[PDB]
Amino acid sequence: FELIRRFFAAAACAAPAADVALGIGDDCALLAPPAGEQLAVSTDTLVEGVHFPAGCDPFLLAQRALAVSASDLAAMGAAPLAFTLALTLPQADAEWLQGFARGLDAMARQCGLALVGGDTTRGPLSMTLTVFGRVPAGQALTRAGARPGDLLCVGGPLGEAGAALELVLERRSAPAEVAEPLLARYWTPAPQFGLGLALRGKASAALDISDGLLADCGHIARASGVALLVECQRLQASAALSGLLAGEEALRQQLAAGDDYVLVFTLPPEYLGEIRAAWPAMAVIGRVEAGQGVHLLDADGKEL
Amino acid sequence: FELIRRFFAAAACAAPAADVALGIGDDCALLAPPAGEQLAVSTDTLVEGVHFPAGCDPFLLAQRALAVSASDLAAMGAAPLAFTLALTLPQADAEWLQGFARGLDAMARQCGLALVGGDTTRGPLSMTLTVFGRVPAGQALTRAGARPGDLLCVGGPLGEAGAALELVLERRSAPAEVAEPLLARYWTPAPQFGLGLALRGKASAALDISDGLLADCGHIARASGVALLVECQRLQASAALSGLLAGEEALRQQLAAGDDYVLVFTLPPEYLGEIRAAWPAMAVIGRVEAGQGVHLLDADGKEL
Ligand SMILES: Nc1ncnc2c1ncn2[C@@H]1O[C@H](COP(=O)(O)OP(=O)(O)NP(=O)(O)O)[C@@H](O)[C@H]1O
Ligand SMILES: Nc1ncnc2c1ncn2[C@@H]1O[C@H](COP(=O)(O)OP(=O)(O)NP(=O)(O)O)[C@@H](O)[C@H]1O
Ligand SMILES: Cc1ncc(C[n+]2csc(CCOP(=O)(O)O)c2C)c(N)n1
Ligand SMILES: Cc1ncc(C[n+]2csc(CCOP(=O)(O)O)c2C)c(N)n1
Ligand SMILES: [Ca+2]
Ligand SMILES: [Ca+2]
Ligand SMILES: [Ca+2]
Ligand SMILES: [Ca+2]
Ligand SMILES: [Ca+2]
Ligand SMILES: [Ca+2]
Ligand SMILES: [Ca+2]
Ligand SMILES: [Ca+2]
Ligand SMILES: [Ca+2]
Ligand SMILES: [Ca+2]
Ligand SMILES: [Ca+2]
Ligand SMILES: [Ca+2]
Ligand SMILES: [Ca+2]
Numbered sequence: 069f070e071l072i073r074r075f076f077a078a079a080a081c082a083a084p085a086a087d088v089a090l091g092i093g094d095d096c097a098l099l100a101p102p103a104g105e106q107l108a109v110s111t112d113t114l115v116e117g118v119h120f121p122a123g124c125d126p127f128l129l130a131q132r133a134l135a136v137s138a139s140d141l142a143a144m145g146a147a148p149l150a151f152t153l154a155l156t157l158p159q160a161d162a163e164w165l166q167g168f169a170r171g172l173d174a175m176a177r178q179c180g181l182a183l184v185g186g187d188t189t190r191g192p193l194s195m196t197l198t199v200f201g202r203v204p205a206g207q208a209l210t211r212a213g214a215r216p217g218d219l220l221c222v223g224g225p226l227g228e229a230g231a232a233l234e235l236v237l238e239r240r241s242a243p244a245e246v247a248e249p250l251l252a253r254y255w256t257p258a259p260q261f262g263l264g265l266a267l268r269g270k271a272s273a274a275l276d277i278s279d280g281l282l283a284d285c286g287h288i289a290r291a292s293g294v295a296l297l298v299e300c301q302r303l304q305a306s307a308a309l310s311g312l313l314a315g316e317e318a319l320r321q322q323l324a325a326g327d328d329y330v331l332v333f334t335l336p337p338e339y340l341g342e343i344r345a346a347w348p349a350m351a352v353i354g355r356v357e358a359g360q361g362v363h364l365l366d367a368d369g370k371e372l
Numbered sequence: 373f374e375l376i377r378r379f380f381a382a383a384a385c386a387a388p389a390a391d392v393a394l395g396i397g398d399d400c401a402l403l404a405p406p407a408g409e410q411l412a413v414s415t416d417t418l419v420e421g422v423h424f425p426a427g428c429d430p431f432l433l434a435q436r437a438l439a440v441s442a443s444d445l446a447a448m449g450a451a452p453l454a455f456t457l458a459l460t461l462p463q464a465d466a467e468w469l470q471g472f473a474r475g476l477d478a479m480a481r482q483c484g485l486a487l488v489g490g491d492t493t494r495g496p497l498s499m500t501l502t503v504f505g506r507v508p509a510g511q512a513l514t515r516a517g518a519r520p521g522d523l524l525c526v527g528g529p530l531g532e533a534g535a536a537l538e539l540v541l542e543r544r545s546a547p548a549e550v551a552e553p554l555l556a557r558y559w560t561p562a563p564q565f566g567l568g569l570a571l572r573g574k575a576s577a578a579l580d581i582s583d584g585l586l587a588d589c590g591h592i593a594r595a596s597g598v599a600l601l602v603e604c605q606r607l608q609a610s611a612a613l614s615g616l617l618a619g620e621e622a623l624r625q626q627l628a629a630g631d632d633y634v635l636v637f638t639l640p641p642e643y644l645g646e647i648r649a650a651w652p653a654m655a656v657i658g659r660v661e662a663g664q665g666v667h668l669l670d671a672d673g674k675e676l
């Protein structure tokens with residue numbers, strides 16, 4: 069118990085914060101959600117050996133856990149507010165917990181997220197973070213509004229965290245300056261809060277890419293009752309990705325690595341200029357048509 | 373994925389509900405918290421082999437997980453609103469998930485809790501539930517307000533879930549009619565929502581008993597800067613507990629079993645009649661004095 073007060077109640081991100089009436093210390097936290105906005109709520113579990121490697125640095129792990137969880141707020145166009153941390157520990161290592169809380173502080177500061185509570189238990193290493201944000205009624209980015217003619221877009225480079233995973237698992241090697249930007253996408257992805265806000269009233273549908281580009285395109289296609297067409301030639305590897313992989317290897321990571329935590333969204337053509345101006349890292353990758361399913365097209369428009 | 377729609381999106385407790393603008397289906401749920409009240413937020417993890425036995429009936433397990441999590445809302449005097457379910461599964465067994473969702477529905481209905489979202493992952497069996505409730509500002513039951521002279525009270529019989537655990541783990545046996553009420557306290561404890569509401573403006577401090585009576589009395593003693601005195605002679609075993617255990621065995625379970633999910637609270641003497649009238653199952657177990665720590669006293673007032 070005492071390590072909770074020492075490491076988390078005392079953490080910088082657990083300090084008093086706006087819209088938080090009561091933080092760590094009681095049976096519940098108390099939020100005063102801003103009047104006139106809805107509260108966006110999402111929860112994510114990271115499991116040792118599944119979402120991160122055993123033996124990893126806890127300073128990095130805490131940032132990854134909070135970032136991948138906070139990304140679902142950006143996927144709704146919500147502004148960040150607070151979170152809770154449920155932590156399951158095989159043993160209560162003070163030095164591990166110290167590094168974990170240090171990394172949690174760093175990512176929470178960068179995300180504007182107040183730590184208001186949590187839970188600590190014993191067992192195989194796992195953590196579940198529940199994040200809270202605010203969005204005006206009727207302005208949240210949902211998945212069901214895509215229409216034929218909409219552009220299919222992403223908020224940034226794809227495949228970088230999958231390339232990074234090869235390095236993390238020591239299944240591939242790279243020069244240090246190639247590894248560093250890719251490892252940053254795995255351990256410290258940046259939730260695309262600013263893009264989510266910019267897409268309010270403009271994107272017809274949106275979510276974040278967690279499972280993988282093609283898989284997660286499926287949610288828009290199914291919820292909206294349309295076909296999504298991904299154009300292979302529009303999947304250009306970033307400089308960072310290209311430092312490690314080429315051709316088909318890079319393409320496969322873009323299509324199916326997941327862990328990107330960039331938004332995939334459909335956009336009426338009339339808003340392309342506004343979103344390009346507000347978020348130059350966005351890219352058009354395809355289009356929406358009438359029909360069903362997700363379709364990958366080659367340079368000639370033939371299905372793969 | 374499809375089992376989520378089949379078993380949880382289709383669950384009765386996931387139906388449209390008041391103050392829920394968006395339930396299951398997107399990257400976040402959207403809550404419309406009632407204006408003029410704070411949102412109580414708590415999260416709990418249950419780990420296989422720690423908080424429930426391997427191989428157990430999922431219909432019972434789902435009720436236990438939600439009830440023990442919802443109890444923290446009662447511990448703040450909050451009225452129930454909604455919850456999310458993060459579930460980690462070693463394998464996706466359709467019959468297990470069906471029973472789990474059936475039990476989740478039953479307990480969620482009895483608790484008035486809408487299922488609005490969650491997360492599903494692979495790994496050693498675990499679940500983290502995050503519960504949401506509402507409480508007027510300034511009326512939540514906190515831990516720091518106890519004063520010397522306050523009565524120390526609990527909301528119901530103690531030790532019953534610890535007695536039950538002996539049966540659950542097959543470390544003890546009992547006639548069926550003795551086992552049934554105790555097993556009900558382990559698998560389906562009733563969060564004391566009505567008591568939490570009745571204690572608004574009356575209890576000086578409160579929390580629920582999860583770790584154990586003496587351990588959890590420590591939180592009030594430390595937060596309030598007082599001594600809590602538990603009177604052994606006031607720890608009378610219930611009929612249900614007495615069906616299985618006697619004397620010291622029953623007392624030890626009352627003091628240290630935990631898993632009671634009844635409230636422990638301090639109460640100004642002038643409110644005893646009101647709380648007895650509203651919640652006849654409550655019991656006075658001791659008193660608050662100036663000083664520090666938790667103290668167990670015998671019939672003669674000597675410390676044990
Ligand atoms: N890993 C964690 N990170 C942040 N806050 C935490 C963490 N674990 C616990 N907390 C918070 O720190 C306090 C722990 O005190 P405790 O009395 O154990 O809370 P609780 O919610 O009543 N525990 P329980 O009902 O037994 O699950 C609570 O306010 C928790 O919300
Ligand atoms: N065990 C569960 N119980 C209840 N709802 C769940 C559960 N698992 C997932 N959900 C919800 O069902 C939907 C699952 O769709 P999905 O697109 O996978 O959501 P998500 O939150 O974007 N997934 P991810 O970002 O990869 O963690 C979401 O609305 C979840 O909140
Ligand atoms: C050590 C390690 N770290 C990361 C990964 C990548 N990874 C795990 S799960 C998942 C999909 C989303 O999770 P879920 O399916 O639970 O929704 C992805 C892209 C890995 N394979 N190994
Ligand atoms: C199979 C099984 N089911 C239940 C129990 C009882 N139990 C586990 S943890 C705990 C304290 C609160 O949890 P925590 O310490 O994680 O806060 C209690 C009372 C058990 N020992 N075994
Ligand atoms: Ca809690
Ligand atoms: Ca509690
Ligand atoms: Ca997830
Ligand atoms: Ca997520
Ligand atoms: Ca360098
Ligand atoms: Ca969305
Ligand atoms: Ca998944
Ligand atoms: Ca998906
Ligand atoms: Ca989510
Ligand atoms: Ca998502
Ligand atoms: Ca707990
Ligand atoms: Ca709890
Ligand atoms: Ca019977």
Ligand SMILES: [Ca+2]
Binds near residue numbers: 096448513515579580
């Ligand atoms: Ca309380």
Ligand SMILES: [Ca+2]
Binds near residue numbers: 583
């Ligand atoms: Ca505990």
Ligand SMILES: [Ca+2]
Binds near residue numbers: 582584587
């Ligand atoms: Ca405790």
